[PDB]
Design a protein around this motif. Structure first.
Motif, PDB file in Angstrom:
ATOM      1  N   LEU A  77      -9.190  18.151 -16.128  1.00 48.76           N
ATOM      2  CA  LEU A  77      -8.212  18.385 -17.184  1.00 48.76           C
ATOM      3  C   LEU A  77      -8.823  18.101 -18.543  1.00 48.76           C
ATOM      4  O   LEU A  77      -8.654  18.881 -19.482  1.00 48.76           O
ATOM      5  CB  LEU A  77      -6.982  17.504 -16.956  1.00 48.76           C
ATOM      6  N   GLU A 118      -0.666  17.153 -12.671  1.00 47.26           N
ATOM      7  CA  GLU A 118      -0.841  18.534 -12.246  1.00 47.26           C
ATOM      8  C   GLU A 118       0.012  19.473 -13.079  1.00 47.26           C
ATOM      9  O   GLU A 118      -0.440  20.546 -13.482  1.00 47.26           O
ATOM     10  CB  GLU A 118      -0.485  18.667 -10.771  1.00 47.26           C
ATOM     11  N   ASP A 119       1.265  19.097 -13.324  1.00 48.99           N
ATOM     12  CA  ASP A 119       2.116  19.961 -14.132  1.00 48.99           C
ATOM     13  C   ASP A 119       1.531  20.143 -15.520  1.00 48.99           C
ATOM     14  O   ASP A 119       1.441  21.267 -16.027  1.00 48.99           O
ATOM     15  CB  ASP A 119       3.526  19.381 -14.220  1.00 48.99           C
ATOM     16  N   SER A 149       2.230  10.315  -9.944  1.00 51.95           N
ATOM     17  CA  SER A 149       1.303  10.491 -11.053  1.00 51.95           C
ATOM     18  C   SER A 149       0.522  11.786 -10.901  1.00 51.95           C
ATOM     19  O   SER A 149       0.323  12.524 -11.873  1.00 51.95           O
ATOM     20  CB  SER A 149       0.345   9.308 -11.126  1.00 51.95           C
ATOM     21  N   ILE A 150       0.074  12.072  -9.675  1.00 49.73           N
ATOM     22  CA  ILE A 150      -0.691  13.286  -9.426  1.00 49.73           C
ATOM     23  C   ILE A 150       0.146  14.510  -9.752  1.00 49.73           C
ATOM     24  O   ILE A 150      -0.339  15.465 -10.367  1.00 49.73           O
ATOM     25  CB  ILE A 150      -1.172  13.312  -7.968  1.00 49.73           C
ATOM     26  N   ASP A 151       1.415  14.498  -9.352  1.00 53.97           N
ATOM     27  CA  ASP A 151       2.280  15.636  -9.627  1.00 53.97           C
ATOM     28  C   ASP A 151       2.422  15.864 -11.124  1.00 53.97           C
ATOM     29  O   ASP A 151       2.324  17.000 -11.605  1.00 53.97           O
ATOM     30  CB  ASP A 151       3.656  15.416  -9.006  1.00 53.97           C
ATOM     31  N   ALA A 187       0.829  -1.201   0.000  1.00 59.33           N
ATOM     32  CA  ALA A 187       0.000   0.000   0.000  1.00 59.33           C
ATOM     33  C   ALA A 187       0.866   1.254   0.000  1.00 59.33           C
ATOM     34  O   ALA A 187       0.534   2.248  -0.660  1.00 59.33           O
ATOM     35  CB  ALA A 187      -0.945  -0.007   1.198  1.00 59.33           C
ATOM     36  N   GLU A 188       1.981   1.225   0.728  1.00 61.00           N
ATOM     37  CA  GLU A 188       2.857   2.388   0.803  1.00 61.00           C
ATOM     38  C   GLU A 188       3.442   2.725  -0.562  1.00 61.00           C
ATOM     39  O   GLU A 188       3.448   3.892  -0.989  1.00 61.00           O
ATOM     40  CB  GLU A 188       3.970   2.122   1.815  1.00 61.00           C
ATOM     41  N   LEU A 214      -1.615  19.780 -16.492  1.00 61.12           N
ATOM     42  CA  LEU A 214      -2.869  20.520 -16.469  1.00 61.12           C
ATOM     43  C   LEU A 214      -2.621  22.000 -16.254  1.00 61.12           C
ATOM     44  O   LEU A 214      -3.278  22.841 -16.871  1.00 61.12           O
ATOM     45  CB  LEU A 214      -3.782  19.970 -15.379  1.00 61.12           C
ATOM     46  N   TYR A 215      -1.678  22.342 -15.379  1.00 59.97           N
ATOM     47  CA  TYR A 215      -1.360  23.747 -15.171  1.00 59.97           C
ATOM     48  C   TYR A 215      -0.766  24.365 -16.425  1.00 59.97           C
ATOM     49  O   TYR A 215      -1.058  25.522 -16.752  1.00 59.97           O
ATOM     50  CB  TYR A 215      -0.403  23.896 -13.989  1.00 59.97           C
ATOM     51  N   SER A 221       2.212   1.926  -3.399  1.00 61.58           N
ATOM     52  CA  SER A 221       1.088   2.468  -4.149  1.00 61.58           C
ATOM     53  C   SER A 221       0.924   3.953  -3.873  1.00 61.58           C
ATOM     54  O   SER A 221       0.708   4.747  -4.795  1.00 61.58           O
ATOM     55  CB  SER A 221      -0.194   1.739  -3.772  1.00 61.58           C
ATOM     56  N   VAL A 222       1.014   4.334  -2.601  1.00 65.34           N
ATOM     57  CA  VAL A 222       0.827   5.730  -2.224  1.00 65.34           C
ATOM     58  C   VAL A 222       1.843   6.603  -2.946  1.00 65.34           C
ATOM     59  O   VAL A 222       1.501   7.640  -3.535  1.00 65.34           O
ATOM     60  CB  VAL A 222       0.948   5.885  -0.696  1.00 65.34           C
ATOM     61  N   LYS A 282       1.023  26.995  -7.588  1.00 64.29           N
ATOM     62  CA  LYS A 282       0.908  25.613  -7.149  1.00 64.29           C
ATOM     63  C   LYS A 282       1.629  25.429  -5.819  1.00 64.29           C
ATOM     64  O   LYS A 282       2.794  25.804  -5.674  1.00 64.29           O
ATOM     65  CB  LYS A 282       1.505  24.675  -8.177  1.00 64.29           C
ATOM     66  N   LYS A 337       3.081  22.837  -3.133  1.00 65.35           N
ATOM     67  CA  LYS A 337       3.552  21.473  -2.990  1.00 65.35           C
ATOM     68  C   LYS A 337       4.358  21.372  -1.710  1.00 65.35           C
ATOM     69  O   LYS A 337       5.182  22.240  -1.421  1.00 65.35           O
ATOM     70  CB  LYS A 337       4.406  21.057  -4.169  1.00 65.35           C
ATOM     71  N   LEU A 384       1.137   6.911  -6.688  1.00 65.65           N
ATOM     72  CA  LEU A 384      -0.017   7.766  -6.923  1.00 65.65           C
ATOM     73  C   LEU A 384       0.356   9.230  -6.780  1.00 65.65           C
ATOM     74  O   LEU A 384      -0.075  10.071  -7.577  1.00 65.65           O
ATOM     75  CB  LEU A 384      -1.131   7.402  -5.949  1.00 65.65           C
TER      76      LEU A 384
END
Ligand code: ADP
Ligand code: MG
Lengths: 371, 56, 66, 56, 188
Positions: free
Chosen positions: D32, B29-30, B24-26, B14-15, B32-33, B17-18, E139, E141, B21
């Motif tokens: 997005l 985000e880059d 991927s989110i970062d 699980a760790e 999309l911004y 995975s964290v 942003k 972080k 994730l």
């Protein structure tokens, strides 16, 4: 070999090899030493970032232009700028290339002599030639007559030329230019609450001026309209958020050009120094100068200036003459394009100041026949 | 001992995975911004075009 | 003089306009439709991930509930 | 006992966190895509304009 | 503060030895709430939060809403009577004192370290708070490496292992010549 057409300017150094259409490397002329202490070891921190590198680290630097008003006030920094321009932005050693600097009219002699002495001793060029910044802008337009108003960022000068014969008694040099407009804009922004003080934030105010300001066709009507409606308020996002809204500061900043009393200068605007420069000319070439008024330099890029200036001159001039204002889209690099054309000419190839000539007469050779 | 082994393995999976994730989110985000800034720029240049039309 | 204005103006008066129109057409074609299709594809994959997450969460909550 | 209590507790925190992360991921991705689709609609507006400009 | 609010259930720890027991309770049970009022409302209705803990002699204790009230003091220092603003607002103030052109980079590279930043759920509460304070475009972080506790020492090892740093030490002969006040001098 090919010639190096450098153009020091004041605010943007434009350089490139002779015979092209646009300068190869254009970058601000600022040299900024770091001002804080610095705790990371081995980060590879230099002692002075010049050119476009100091426009990215400007948050912790103290940028200072080495050229105030055409003249050069800090020779070590100017030497550093030239060294950067030659070695890193063009990557051509100066030992194998002639150079063609440019200089504003009516500048101190010592500036020009020191410039040639540096170019011949430190960089050791084969041959260099100094040309007046307005004749080149007249070359680029493909004309041979006309009165050119070259409103740069340091100094605005207005050189009339007829049939290739310059009129030395009719040059009207005025020291209002883009930098004073930046300072005045930074000073009137304080009327809404936005305070920019640091020498780094002057760059932000310059960006605001470039992107938003425009020259009003009629000043009083715009002042009345902006005070009733709100169709003018354009917003702009700072480098960190907190958008700002510019109201009637939009056309009040560049209006200083036509009313230099705003920043306390006595002289008349750029709309009336051109007419005065024309009236000093002879009575038989005034029609041609009226019809071939040329604009150049960066600061003449404001949206709507080629109409305001024409309206003003038509008001001043006699009703019969036709007033035409040449405003090419490539205004900013007009001086450098003209410099490239001049350096590419075969007839000009024997006007360079060859090094042996400098060795025989010293730096004072520039004022002599090789102008 | 058996419960400990199974719990530790589940935790570690699980760790990891964290962490993945978060990465991927970062990245999303880059991107999309960057798209957001692109959109603001296109709209602003569009408005400049409109004002240019107003001029001429 | 004044005879190179034609050979430096008329050229880009048409070639530049046509070339920029070509660039805009090709860029729009390459960009917009592919981006919308790819975003729809990623949305479908995201919905499938959501279904898998719901199933796994529910089965684990069913077993672990003691 | 201390070890396995710790492991299960931190694992439960991990599961709740990761599920919140997944909701975040989906919302970000869908937003997005919506923004990108708005941008492409704007691009096709511009492309209709370019087809008009085919007048040149 | 945890030792002071535990007295609201009946458990009194006074001796300087029992401060260690309260520290162990804080380390093993407390966590930072994502939203304070909602947690206060939930802990006052249900009983899904009450976690028990066995003292060094038996007599297990049950911690209720003391779990997220102890580390909440970081974001509201008015709980222990301190005037200043929480760690969520002194970071924003520290950023705003910086120059206007490096605020984006500082926003994007906020680093957490030290032991006390190991509470489960602090890297989200702090990000939410700063995002509330900061402009909407930037942003935010928050870098929270798993090796937070020893981050300072790992950095110290890296710095001591550098070759460029090898001549910055305060050599003994230098101390003999200038006295202990050498530390404030160039060798910082
Ligand atoms: N697009 C623009 N709109 C308005 N002002 C501009 C624009 N571009 C440049 N400027 C102004 O002109 C200056 C650059 O002038 P420039 O012609 O480079 O001076 P120089 O003669 O020293 O090269 C800048 O400082 C800026 O203030
Ligand atoms: Mg110039």
């Amino acid at each position: 070999t090919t010639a190096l057409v450098c153009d020091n300017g004041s605010g943007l150094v434009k350089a490139g090899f002779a015979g092209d259409d646009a300068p190869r490397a254009v970058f601000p002329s600022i040299v900024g030493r770091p001002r804080h202490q610095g705790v990371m070891v081995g980060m590879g921190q230099k002692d002075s970032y010049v050119g476009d590198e100091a426009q990215s680290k400007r948050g912790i630097l103290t940028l200072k232009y080495p050229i105030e008003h055409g003249i050069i006030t800090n020779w070590d920094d100017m030497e550093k700028i030239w060294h950067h321009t030659f070695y890193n932005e063009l990557r051509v050693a100066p030992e194998e290339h002639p150079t063609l600097l440019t200089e504003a009219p009516l500048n101190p002699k010592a500036n020009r002599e020191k410039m040639t002495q540096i170019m011949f001793e430190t960089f050791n060029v084969p041959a260099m030639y100094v040309a007046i910044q307005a004749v080149l802008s007249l070359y680029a337009s493909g004309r041979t007559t006309g009165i050119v108003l070259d409103s740069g960022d340091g100094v605005t000068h207005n050189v009339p030329i007829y049939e290739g014969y310059a009129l030395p008694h009719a040059i009207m040099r005025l020291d209002l230019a883009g930098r004073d407009l930046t300072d005045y804009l930074m000073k009137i922004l304080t009327e809404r609450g936005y305070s920019f003080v640091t020498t780094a934030e002057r760059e932000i105010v310059r960006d605001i001026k470039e992107k938003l300001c425009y020259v009003a066709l009629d000043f009083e009507n715009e002042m009345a309209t902006a005070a009733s409606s709100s169709s003018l308020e354009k917003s702009y996002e700072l480098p960190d958020g907190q958008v700002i809204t510019i109201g009637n500061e939009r056309f009040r900043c560049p209006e200083t050009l036509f009313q230099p009393s705003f920043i306390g200068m006595e002289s008349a605007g750029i709309h009336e120094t051109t007419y005065n420069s024309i009236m000093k000319c002879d009575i038989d070439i005034r029609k041609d100068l009226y019809a071939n008024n040329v604009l150049s330099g960066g600061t003449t890029m404001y949206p709507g200036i080629a109409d305001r200036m024409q309206k003003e001159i038509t008001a001043l001039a006699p009703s019969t003459m036709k007033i035409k204002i040449i405003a090419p889209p490539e205004r900013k690099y007009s001086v450098w394009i003209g410099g490239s054309i001049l350096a590419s000419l075969s007839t000009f190839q024997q006007m360079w100041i060859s090094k042996q000539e400098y060795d025989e007469a010293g730096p004072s050779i520039v004022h002599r026949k090789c102008f | 001992s058996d419960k400990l082994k199974e719990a530790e393995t589940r935790a570690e999976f699980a760790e990891r995975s964290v962490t993945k994730l978060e990465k991927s989110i970062d990245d999303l985000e880059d991107e999309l911004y960057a798209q957001k800034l692109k959109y603001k720029a296109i709209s602003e240049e569009l408005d400049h075009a409109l004002n240019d039309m107003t001029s001429i | 003089d004044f005879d190179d204005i034609h050979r430096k103006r008329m050229e880009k008066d048409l070639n530049e306009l046509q070339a920029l129109i070509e660039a805009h057409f090709e860029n729009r074609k390459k960009e917009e439709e592919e981006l919308v299709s790819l975003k729809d594809r990623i949305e479908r994959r995201r919905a499938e991930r959501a279904e898998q997450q719901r199933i796994r969460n529910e089965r684990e909550k069913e077993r672990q509930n003691r």
